[PDB]
């Protein structure tokens, strides 16, 4: 949370990456620890070279960061499970995203509430004329 320790990967730079929204509204970042030096592909186009130790890389959307993360899971023979996702604001604040608890959402850990979990079947949705001329919708209620 303090600072993003690492190094930009050995790359020749790409013109298909960050845009003015990166310095204007928000932009993304991802860090990981590499067991050994090898080569990967960066989701905005091209192949980059990671280095052993901490690596720092910046992106602009969540799709790119999670595609890269799934690549570092399911491409390399020594599996990497040490990638964290960060978002930075131009005001200088940083925020952690995932995994917030520290374990993947594929499995189950305690200390968690369940929300958006309605206890009714498909046909037990309220029929729309009882919601007619109200601010809500049948899917919300």
């Amino acid at each position: 949370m303090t600072e993003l320790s690492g190094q930009p990967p050995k790359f020749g730079g790409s013109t298909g990456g960050l845009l003015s929204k990166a310095n204007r509204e928000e932009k993304y970042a991802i860090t990981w620890t590499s067991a050994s030096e090898q080569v990967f592909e960066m989701p905005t186009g091209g192949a980059a070279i990671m280095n052993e130790g901490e690596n720092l890389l910046y992106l602009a959307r969540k799709e790119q960061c999670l595609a890269l993360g799934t690549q570092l899971r399911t491409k390399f023979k020594p599996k990497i499970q040490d990638y964290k996702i960060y978002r930075v604001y131009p005001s200088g604040e940083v925020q952690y995203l995932h995994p917030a608890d520290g374990v993947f959402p594929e499995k189950v850990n305690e200390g968690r509430e369940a929300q958006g979990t309605k206890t009714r079947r498909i046909g037990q949705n309220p029929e729309p004329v009882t919601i007619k001329f109200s601010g809500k919708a049948p899917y919300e209620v």
Partner: protein, 729 residues
């Protein structure tokens, strides 16, 4: 707030789809937030008054144009061999060749020949001068201003009507049957009695003499006491000449029938007597229900007491649905308007009621296909709004075991059997045509299949025709219905058996085949709209159609693929079928009347059985005078129609744009273009305030369909007007 203001859901994003959808949903008042019955009905009433204002101002504008820049009185001097004028042309880009090719009909400025056919209307009502047309224009203008002022007046807080006033159905029906349809027809009947009949016979009626001159030598008391035959004493004979008095009696009400022997028109006495009789019948019909007196009927009692043994619950509790669902009654109203406009179109060519309208073929053809396209549009919209009613306003608990519940139960068999009728009819129509095609391709027309439409000649003969010789029940004097002694028999029997009018044309096998093609288009389009409506609340692919709304893009690549699943997409595939069925109708009508007007009916009687003459005799040969609107030598008056023809062709392909290619590729392209705008020097000093993006799937589909429609109608209108004007100028 930021535009659009009426929904915070559309004011939360910087994308340009916000702008597109803010243009898109400005009339969907139900989707608006903070929305009740009171606000909705008040905006309804305001928008209705605004539309009536648009109607009357449009009529005032066209009337002012035909008054000022037209050639009305020089057409009064001779009404047959002079083309009318719509308005002059103000365009600085005209070279002198086009100026010489457009300044015609005795004018000094370049003008356009009017094909709207309002000249015959203003003649047959009797607007003999331009000053009177100016008075009419200013009168409808101040009437439109009156509706504007009333529309603003009713939206004050003190004059906003209550919910129950809009709810009171019985008073609305009694008023609209009596005080809208009856007394207006009485007024128009009086207008024909006291203005149109004397101006037709020649004697002048001004704005200071009508209170003095009587419309009949006898008074009102023969109408009162015992003898209405005084008004049916001296009709205008067959030797009558319009605008003068030789062979002209002074009867106002008679029903001799037939046509006008001079100009092939309906007698104005027939129209006046007819309007008066319809006025009587609607004034009687306007007193059905109880309003405030206790005498009459109630909608709820009649609609609930009609039960059934095997119907189910009959029609119970429907009144609560139709009165509390605007979409249902809107669909009924639009369906009634569509069928009545189809009847307008298909009755105006056969039994016209205007002087010299049977000669100017361009106006007749244009007006027929005008009202026919209007019919198609309005009543496919009726079907679409019925589908929207099923989406949004159906009540399962209020309509338990209702007739609509039975409809949703047997919708499967209904859709299946629309499909069966469509396939049977289409297979045999196409098979008959292609067998005729292959047979005449080898030079042996004796093996063609020419099915005589026996029922068509049967109804022709029982309606009065004696050419086919079936002589059943009307033309034979031996039947009991011939010696009825009615006053329409000689005029009608003259009208049917005279080979110079378009009424009850001679029918051949090509008419049988093309009528089967029309019935095919009908049944296909009906299948499309019915399965779009009846399956809008359930499908084994997606029974959650009521949850998502009415117009949604898809439901994803899962479950095998869900593209084009909404009822909006059913309308999307419906519109092409509507346009095609209208097209088949209009090609058949135009080719048949070209054959009749040319006098060479044999080419239609022989070449219509096989596609060759459709594609060659009509679609190829009649296009020759179209395209020569500008030869490399010079131009003529048909330049604008040909250039608009090519214009509509380009519109058709430029909508076939959106009708082929979908979103994601276009999104990648426009995103790369955004990157181009980003890194370039001397162009970062200005940045957009609204984010650019590709159109949505539903919006792209809509704009492709709209382009298809406008290009289609533009090309057909241009070809029809130009070819009909070229052949019979």
């Amino acid at each position: 707030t930021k535009f659009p203001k009426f929904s915070q859901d559309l004011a939360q994003d910087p994308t340009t789809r916000r702008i597109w959808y803010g243009i898109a949903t400005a009339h969907d008042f139900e989707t608006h937030d903070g929305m009740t019955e009171e606000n909705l009905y008040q905006k309804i009433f305001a928008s209705h008054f605004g539309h009536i204002a648009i109607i009357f101002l449009w009529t005032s504008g066209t009337l002012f144009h035909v008054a000022w820049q037209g050639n009305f009185e020089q057409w009064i001097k001779d009404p047959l061999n002079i083309r009318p004028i719509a308005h002059a042309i103000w365009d600085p880009h005209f070279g002198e060749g086009a100026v010489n090719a457009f300044t015609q009909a005795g004018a000094s400025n370049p003008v356009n020949i009017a094909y709207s056919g309002v000249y015959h209307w203003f003649y047959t009502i009797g607007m003999t001068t331009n000053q009177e047309l100016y008075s009419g224009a200013v009168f409808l203008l101040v009437l439109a201003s009156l509706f504007l002022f009333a529309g603003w007046l009713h939206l004050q807080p003190k004059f906003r009507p209550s919910l129950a006033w809009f709810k009171n159905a019985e008073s609305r029906l009694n008023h609209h049957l009596a005080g809208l349809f009856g007394v207006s027809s009485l007024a128009w009947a009086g207008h024909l009695v006291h203005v149109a009949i004397p101006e037709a016979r020649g004697q002048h009626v001004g704005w200071d003499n009508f209170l003095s001159t009587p419309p009949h030598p006898a008074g009102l008391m023969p109408f009162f006491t015992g003898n209405w035959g005084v008004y049916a004493a001296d009709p205008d004979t067959a030797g009558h000449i319009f605008g003068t008095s030789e062979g002209a009696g002074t009867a106002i009400l008679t029903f001799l029938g037939g046509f006008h022997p001079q100009t092939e028109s309906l007698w104005l006495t027939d129209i006046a007597h007819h309007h008066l009789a319809i006025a009587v019948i609607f004034i009687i019909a306007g007193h059905m229900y109880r309003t405030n007196w206790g005498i009459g009927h109630s909608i709820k009692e009649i609609l609930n007491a009609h039960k059934g043994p095997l119907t189910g619950a009959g029609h119970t509790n429907l009144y609560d649905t139709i009165n509390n669902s605007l979409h249902f009654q809107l669909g009924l109203a639009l369906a009634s308007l569509g069928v009545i406009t189809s009847l307008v179109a298909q009755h105006m060519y056969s039994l016209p009621s205007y002087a010299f309208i049977a000669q100017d073929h361009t106006t007749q053809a244009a007006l027929y296909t005008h009202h026919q396209y209007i019919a198609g549009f309005l009543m496919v919209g009726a079907f679409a709004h019925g589908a929207i009613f099923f989406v949004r306003d159906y009540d399962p608990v209020a309509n338990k075991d209702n007739v609509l519940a039975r409809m949703l139960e047997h919708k499967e068999a209904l859709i299946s059997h629309l499909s069966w009728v469509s396939l049977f009819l289409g297979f045999h129509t196409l098979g008959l045509y292609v067998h005729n095609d292959v047979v005449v391709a080898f030079g042996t027309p004796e093996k063609q299949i020419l099915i005589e439409p026996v029922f068509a000649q049967w109804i022709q003969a029982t309606s009065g025709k004696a050419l086919y010789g079936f002589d059943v029940l009307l033309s034979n004097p031996d039947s009991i219905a011939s010696t009825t002694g009615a006053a329409w028999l000689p005029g009608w029997l003259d009208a049917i058996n005279s080979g110079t009018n378009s009424l009850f044309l001679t029918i051949g096998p090509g008419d049988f085949l093309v009528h089967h093609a029309i019935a095919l288009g009908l049944h296909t389009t009906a299948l499309i709209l019915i399965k779009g409506a009846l399956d809008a609340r359930g499908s084994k692919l997606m029974p959650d159609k009521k949850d998502f709304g009415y117009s949604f893009p898809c439901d994803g690549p899962g479950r095998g693929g869900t593209c084009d699943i909404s009822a909006w997409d059913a309308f999307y595939l419906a519109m092409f079928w509507m346009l095609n069925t209208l097209g088949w109708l209009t090609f058949y009508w135009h080719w048949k009347h070209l054959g009749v007007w040319s006098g060479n009916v044999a080419q239609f009687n022989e070449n219509s059985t096989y596609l060759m003459g459709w594609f060659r005799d009509y679609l190829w040969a009649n296009s020759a005078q179209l395209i020569n609107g500008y030869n490399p030598y010079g131009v003529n008056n048909l330049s604008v129609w040909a250039w608009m023809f090519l214009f509509g062709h380009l519109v058709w392909a430029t909508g076939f744009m959106f009708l082929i290619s979908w979103r994601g590729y276009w999104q990648e392209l426009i995103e790369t273009i955004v990157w181009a705008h980003e890194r370039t020097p001397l162009a970062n000093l200005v940045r957009w305030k609204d984010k650019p993006v590709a159109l949505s799937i539903v919006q792209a589909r809509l704009v492709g369909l709209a382009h298809f429609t406008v290009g289609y109608v533009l090309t057909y209108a241009a070809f029809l007007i130009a070819s009909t004007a070229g052949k019979f100028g």
